[PDB]
Amino acid sequence: KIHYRKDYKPSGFIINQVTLNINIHDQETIVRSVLDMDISKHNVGEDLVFDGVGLKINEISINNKKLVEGEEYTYDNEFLTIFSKFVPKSKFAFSSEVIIHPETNYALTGLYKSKNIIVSQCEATGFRRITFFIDRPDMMAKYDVTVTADKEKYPVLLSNGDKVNEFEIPGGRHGARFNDPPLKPCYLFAVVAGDLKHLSATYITKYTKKKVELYVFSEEKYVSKLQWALECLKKSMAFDEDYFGLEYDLSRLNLVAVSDFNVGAMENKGLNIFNANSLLASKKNSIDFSYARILTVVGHEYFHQYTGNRVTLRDWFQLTLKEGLTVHRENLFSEEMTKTVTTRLSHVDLLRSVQFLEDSSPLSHPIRPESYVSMENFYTTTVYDKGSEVMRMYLTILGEEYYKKGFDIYIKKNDGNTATCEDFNYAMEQAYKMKKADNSANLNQYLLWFSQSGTPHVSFKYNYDAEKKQYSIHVNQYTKPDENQKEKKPLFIPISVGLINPENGKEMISQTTLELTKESDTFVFNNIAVKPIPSLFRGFSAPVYIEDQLTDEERILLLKYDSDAFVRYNSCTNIYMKQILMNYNEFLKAKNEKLESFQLTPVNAQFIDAIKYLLEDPHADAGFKSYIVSLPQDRYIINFVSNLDTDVLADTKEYIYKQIGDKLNDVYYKMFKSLEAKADDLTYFNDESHVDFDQMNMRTLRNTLLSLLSKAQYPNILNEIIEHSKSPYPSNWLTSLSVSAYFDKYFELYDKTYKLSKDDELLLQEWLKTVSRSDRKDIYEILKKLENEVLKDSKNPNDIRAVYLPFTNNLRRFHDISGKGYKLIAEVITKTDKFNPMVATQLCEPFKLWNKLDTKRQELMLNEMNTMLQEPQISNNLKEYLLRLTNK
Numbered sequence: 001k002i003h004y005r006k007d008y009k010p011s012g013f014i015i016n017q018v019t020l021n022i023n024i025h026d027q028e029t030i031v032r033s034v035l036d037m038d039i040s041k042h043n044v045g046e047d048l049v050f051d052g053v054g055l056k057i058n059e060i061s062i063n064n065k066k067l068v069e070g071e072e073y074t075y076d077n078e079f080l081t082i083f084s085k086f087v088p089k090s091k092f093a094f095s096s097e098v099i100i101h102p103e104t105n106y107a108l109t110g111l112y113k114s115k116n117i118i119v120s121q122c123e124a125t126g127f128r129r130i131t132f133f134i135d136r137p138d139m140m141a142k143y144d145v146t147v148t149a150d151k152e153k154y155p156v157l158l159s160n161g162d163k164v165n166e167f168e169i170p171g172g173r174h175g176a177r178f179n180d181p182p183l184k185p186c187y188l189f190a191v192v193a194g195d196l197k198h199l200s201a202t203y204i205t206k207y208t209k210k211k212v213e214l215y216v217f218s219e220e221k222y223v224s225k226l227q228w229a230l231e232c233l234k235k236s237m238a239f240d241e242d243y244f245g246l247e248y249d250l251s252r253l254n255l256v257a258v259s260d261f262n263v264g265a266m267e268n269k270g271l272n273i274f275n276a277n278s279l280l281a282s283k284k285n286s287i288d289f290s291y292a293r294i295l296t297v298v299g300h301e302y303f304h305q306y307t308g309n310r311v312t313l314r315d316w317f318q319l320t321l322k323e324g325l326t327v328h329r330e331n332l333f334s335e336e337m338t339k340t341v342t343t344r345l346s347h348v349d350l351l352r353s354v355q356f357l358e359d360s361s362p363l364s365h366p367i368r369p370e371s372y373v374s375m376e377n378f379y380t381t382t383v384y385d386k387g388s389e390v391m392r393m394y395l396t397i398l399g400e401e402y403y404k405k406g407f408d409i410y411i412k413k414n415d416g417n418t419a420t421c422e423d424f425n426y427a428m429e430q431a432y433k434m435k436k437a438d439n440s441a442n443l444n445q446y447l448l449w450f451s452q453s454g455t456p457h458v459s460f461k462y463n464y465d466a467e468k469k470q471y472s473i474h475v476n477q478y479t480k481p482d483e484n485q486k487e488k489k490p491l492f493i494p495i496s497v498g499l500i501n502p503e504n505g506k507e508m509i510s511q512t513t514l515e516l517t518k519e520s521d522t523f524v525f526n527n528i529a530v531k532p533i534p535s536l537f538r539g540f541s542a543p544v545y546i547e548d549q550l551t552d553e554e555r556i557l558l559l560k561y562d563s564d565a566f567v568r569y570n571s572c573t574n575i576y577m578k579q580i581l582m583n584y585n586e587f588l589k590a591k592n593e594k595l596e597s598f599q600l601t602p603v604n605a606q607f608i609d610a611i612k613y614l615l616e617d618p619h620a621d622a623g624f625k626s627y628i629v630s631l632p633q634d635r636y637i638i639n640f641v642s643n644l645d646t647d648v649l650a651d652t653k654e655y656i657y658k659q660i661g662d663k664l665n666d667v668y669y670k671m672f673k674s675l676e677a678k679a680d681d682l683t684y685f686n687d688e689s690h691v692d693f694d695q696m697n698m699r700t701l702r703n704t705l706l707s708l709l710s711k712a713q714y715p716n717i718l719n720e721i722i723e724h725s726k727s728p729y730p731s732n733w734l735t736s737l738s739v740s741a742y743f744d745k746y747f748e749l750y751d752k753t754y755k756l757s758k759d760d761e762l763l764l765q766e767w768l769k770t771v772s773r774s775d776r777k778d779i780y781e782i783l784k785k786l787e788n789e790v791l792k793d794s795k796n797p798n799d800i801r802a803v804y805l806p807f808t809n810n811l812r813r814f815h816d817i818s819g820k821g822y823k824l825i826a827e828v829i830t831k832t833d834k835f836n837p838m839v840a841t842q843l844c845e846p847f848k849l850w851n852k853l854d855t856k857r858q859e860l861m862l863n864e865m866n867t868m869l870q871e872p873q874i875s876n877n878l879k880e881y882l883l884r885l886t887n888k
C-alpha cells in the first residue's frame, strides 16, 4: 500500500479519550484500553478500522458489549475492521484487552524490553503495536494511563502527564496512574518501567517564574554519567527562553537513557527517551564527541516541545516541519553553546557528503515527499538536514529580528493545533512583507524548496571595470532533472556575499545577501575601488553545489584572509577538489592504458605554504586547522566523479597526502608536541559540568596530526603513539589504537584498549568503532575476531552498528574488487532484518552510492542488493528501501 500526500483526508472518527491499563508480567504484558470515540463530520458510514499490529486479542467490545469475531469484526494482525452496521452513530466507547510481549520485541518499536527496562517507542507507527488505535498524528486525544508491574524489578514507573496515584497490589506488585489532559497525538505517548536511578534539578522559567522539576534517569550502574545531560537540558531551556522567548509549560520533564534504541532519542511529551550513547558520558569513559552529541540531542528533543509537540503535524508528509525546524533550532543552540566555528562547518560537512549523495541517488526525494510505503524510511538526512538548511535560509533572508517575528507568528497562530509546511511559510511571509515594507511581497516561490528534489548548482562569472570602479557578479542556477521533476524550476536562493580587497584582506562592502530568484541574474556594485575577490555563500547560505570559478591563487587569498569561516574552508575544499580530480584522471589513464611510466601534477606549492602559514598562526583556531589538513570526505568527492574507481581514488588521496606531508610533517610534529599542554590539561577531568569545546578541538587537531604522522611513518612516531596510549582521555588512547595500525604494536594496543573499554557498555562500543575503522590489511580477519569474541549474537543496535558501519568507510578494503565486503554487509543486513527492519535499512547505507562506482563494483553491489531482495522473509521496510534504491 502506497500513501500519497495529495490523498490526505480527515478521519470519519474522533477519539476524545484514551484510558489505558498496562499490566506488565514476566511472560506477557496485558493492555486494556477504553477509547471514548465519536463520529466526525467527515463520516460517510464506513467501517471502523483500527491499526493493530501483532496484538493477541483477548476481547473487544463496543459500549461494554463484547464483539463476536467473524460476524462483527475481522482482524488480520494488521487492521481490526469492525463492520459499519455494528458501529454506533453517536458517542460510544470502544474497549479491548490484548496481550503483547515486550521481552521478545527485538524490533524496538512499540513496547519493548531493553536489558531490565521496559520502554516504548511509538513514532511513527509503534503505538498500534501496543493497542488498537487510529494511529495517525491528526487523531488528538486525552490520555489517562495506569501501569502496574512487579515492584522489586520495576520500582520506577513513568508515563506522560502528572502522576496522580500510586498504589500497592497483592503479590509484590504496584501501580501508578498518570493523567495527561492536554491533547496529543499517539506517537508522543510513552511509558517506562525499571529500576532507574536519577539526578534531578529545579528550573525556574524566565518570565512566568514557574518551577519545573528536571529528572534524568539511567540504570544504576551508569547514574554517574548523567551530569552533563542535566546541564545540557538547563542550557536548552534557557536558549529557547533567550532566543525565542519560549518557556516550558509543564511541571516536570524526564529524560531516560536506555541501552537498546533504534535512533538517537525521541521527544515523548515530558518523557524524552534517549539512546544511552546520546545521554550518558563521563570524562573517564567517553570520547570527546559524546559531549557535543549529548548537547545537541538533548537540545533537539527539548526544542521539539514547541516544534512538534505543541505545534504538531497534520500528517506524516509534513515531517520536515518538525524535524527540519527542530534541527535548525538545535543548530542555532549548538553554535551559541560551543562558540566554535567548527560547529557550523561540521553541519555543512555532513550535508555536502551524506545528504548530497542521497539527493543525487535513486533515493532522492524532496524534503516533503509525495509518497511512502514505510514512513520510517523517510526519517532521512534530506528531511532532517536539508530541511534544516531550508529552515535556516528564512533566517538568512529575514535577518534575526524579522525571523524571530515570523517564528513567533507561527507559534502563536498554531499553538495547540496541527500544522503543515504552508503554515510555516505563511508566517515567514508575513515577516517578509514587514521587512520589505510591501504587503504585495510574497514567498510563493520559496515553497519549491519543499517540493523540488535534487541539489541546485550555482555558478558564477565576474567582470571588473577598473575605470568605472564597477564590479559585476553574474550568477546561474540549475537543478538536474531526476525522477521527481522532469522540469526543475529556479529557486529562491539567498547568496550571502562579501568582497575582499586582495591587497590588504579588508572588507569592501557591507553585509549583503543577494536574492537570486531567476535562472540567472547579474548583480552590479559601484564604487569598488580595486578588483575584489568575492566571498560567496558566507555561512553556507544555501544548500547548493557552489561553482566559484575562482583561481587557486584567489582561493588561497580567501583561505588566508577572508572573514567568513565557511568560505575559507570551502576555498580550501575547492583547491583540494581540483587537485583530486586532476590526479584521479592521471592515475585512471595510466591504469586504463597500462602505462609503464607517467606523470602526476604536484600539489600547488603556494597552497601548501598557506596551510603552513595557518597552522603556524598561534591566533588561528585549532578546530579549523584540523579541517584544512584533511582532504574532503570520500562521499563528498564521489558527487564529482562518474564511474568512480575506488582504488584509483585511494591512490589519489595517498599521493596528495604524501605530497603535503613531505613538506609539512616537521610542522605537524612540532605542533603535536606544543599542543600537548593545553589539549590534555586535566584541571577539570573530574568536573563533569566543565566542558571546553576549544580544548576538545585542540585534541582533535593533535589526533589528526598524529594520524598524518603515523601514516607517513615519521621517524620514531611510535614513541609518541605509545605515550599517547597512556593518556586519561579516551579520544587520545583510542586514537593511539587506530594510528598504531601502521605498526607492529597494533594488537598490543588492541588488547590494552579493550581492557580499558570492556567494563563500560558505551566505551566498549567506541572501542568496537575504533577497531572497525582501523586501517588494517587484515581487517576482514579482525572483523571475524570481533564477531566471535565480542559482538556474538547481540541484538543491540549500537553493537551491530559499531562493528560494521565504520568498516564500510574503508575505501580500499570495503570496496575490495572481489565483492567480499559487499557480501559481508549484505549478510549482516539480511540477518538483522529478521528482528529489526529499521536497523537493517540503516546498514544499507554503503549501498546508497552503488550506481556512482565503476562498472564492476556497480554490478557487484547490484547483485548483493538483488540477493537481499529475493529473501522470502524480507521486511516491508527493507524491501521498499532496496526497490527504490535499485530503481526496480
Ligand SMILES: O=C(CNc1ccc(F)cc1)N[C@@H](C(=O)NO)c1ccc(Br)cc1
Pocket (backbone or CB within 6 Å): 123, 124, 262, 263, 264, 265, 266, 267, 300, 301, 304, 323, 376, 379, 842
Ligand atoms: O535520533 C534521531 C537522529 N539521530 C540518529 C542517531 C543514530 C541513528 F542510528 C539514527 C538516528 N532522530 C529522531 C528524532 O527526530 N528525535 O526527535 C527520530 C525519532 C523517531 C524516528 Br521514527 C526516527 C528518528
Ligand SMILES: [Zn+2]
Pocket (backbone or CB within 6 Å): 267, 300, 304, 322, 323, 326
Ligand atoms: Zn526530532
